[PDB]
Ligand binder design. Structure first.
Ligand code: PPS
Ligand code: NPO
Ligand code: NPO
Length: 289
């Protein structure tokens, strides 16, 4: 059974057993100078930005972006599961320019990305909304260990005992890295508030100037209500064994502030006290609504 196993430590970080088992293949990954790396802590807007990027690369052409599922269009690099998927091999066989997805903490990223000085788009999302999203995701996406109860999962998340390790270190270290490499550091909440502005930031970073009409086309097709019903973007092409959408849909709510529906007031106060202690060494600032 490839599903529901315990995580395995990889250079200090809990990862899926099969990623750990094939780690040398990940660490030796060969990047290319024109790769665009989308880097996120899980549940922070990876699919959203991956769809935006593929739409940009295809000039807002919806049909072209339906050539395959997002997880084939924008391969999840480190995700290797025997009999199921191999992100490294998918990318190895993909023509440039490649869009590459990762959730790896900075210290675990294959060094080829640094050596090739690749452009990277990092997306961060407020921790409270992340942990709620990740809880439901753990339930539906069977490669993860059992999340337990909300209360149990919340504690594991705060302790960094979840797949890809602690959110706090992930966002903080990636933030620091922006001083060394070309990292456009985006926030899920900004994309919610003003998607046009954020996509304009992406275009400037990519050194692309496109017509307003194409920009509006990209905006329309990357909206939650369009993506949620789009089989090429909403993960419903996954086998039920890998992802069971009847448990929780991948495109779940797509808002900011769902944490209010999940956290008890006590859980919130405790989470905030812990958060301030973990995040005061950082100039990083988030909005929770
Ligand atoms: N277009 C658009 N607009 C707004 N929100 C969106 C969009 N697409 C995905 N989502 C929401 O993003 C959450 C999934 O994040 P990820 O794509 O990073 O998940 S994953 O790490 O790639 O598995 C998950 O958030 P929750 O709804 O809070 O669970 C998705 O619903
Ligand atoms: O099989 N799976 O569970 C997968 C496969 C590919 C992917 O990008 C994410 C999950
Ligand atoms: O376990 N999974 O199937 C996953 C996990 C993380 C992710 O971003 C996509 C799929």
């Amino acid at each position: 059974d490839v599903f529901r196993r315990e995580l395995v430590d990889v250079e200090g970080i809990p990862l899926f057993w099969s990623i750990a088992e094939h780690w040398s293949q990940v660490e030796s990954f060969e990047a290319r100078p024109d790769d665009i790396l989308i880097s996120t802590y899980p549940k922070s807007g990876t699919t959203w930005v991956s769809e935006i990027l593929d739409l940009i690369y295809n000039n807002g052409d919806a049909e072209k972006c339906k050539r395959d599922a997002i997880y084939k269009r924008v391969p999840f690099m480190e995700l290797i599961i025997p009999g199921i998927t191999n992100g490294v091999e998918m990318l190895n066989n993909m023509p440039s320019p490649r869009i590459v997805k990762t959730h790896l903490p900075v210290q675990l990223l294959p060094s080829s990305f640094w050596k090739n000085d690749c452009k990277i788009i990092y997306v961060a999302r407020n921790a409270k909304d992340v942990v709620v999203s990740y809880y439901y995701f753990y339930q539906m996406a069977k490669i993860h260990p059992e999340p337990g109860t909300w209360e149990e999962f919340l504690e594991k998340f705060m302790a960094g005992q979840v797949s890809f390790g602690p959110w706090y270190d992930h966002v903080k270290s990636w933030w620091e890295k922006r001083k060394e490499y070309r990292i456009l550091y985006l926030f899920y909440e900004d994309m919610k508030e003003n998607p046009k502005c954020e996509i304009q930031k992406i275009l400037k970073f990519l050194e692309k100037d496109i017509p307003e009409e194409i920009l509006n086309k990209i905006l329309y097709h990357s909206s939650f209500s369009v993506m949620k019903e789009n089989p090429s973007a909403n993960y419903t092409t996954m086998m039920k064994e890998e992802m069971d959408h009847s448990v929780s849909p991948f495109m779940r709510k797509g808002i900011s502030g769902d944490w209010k529906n999940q956290f008890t007031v006590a859980q919130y106060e405790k989470f905030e006290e812990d958060y301030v202690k973990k995040m005061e060494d950082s100039t990083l600032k988030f909005r929770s609504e």
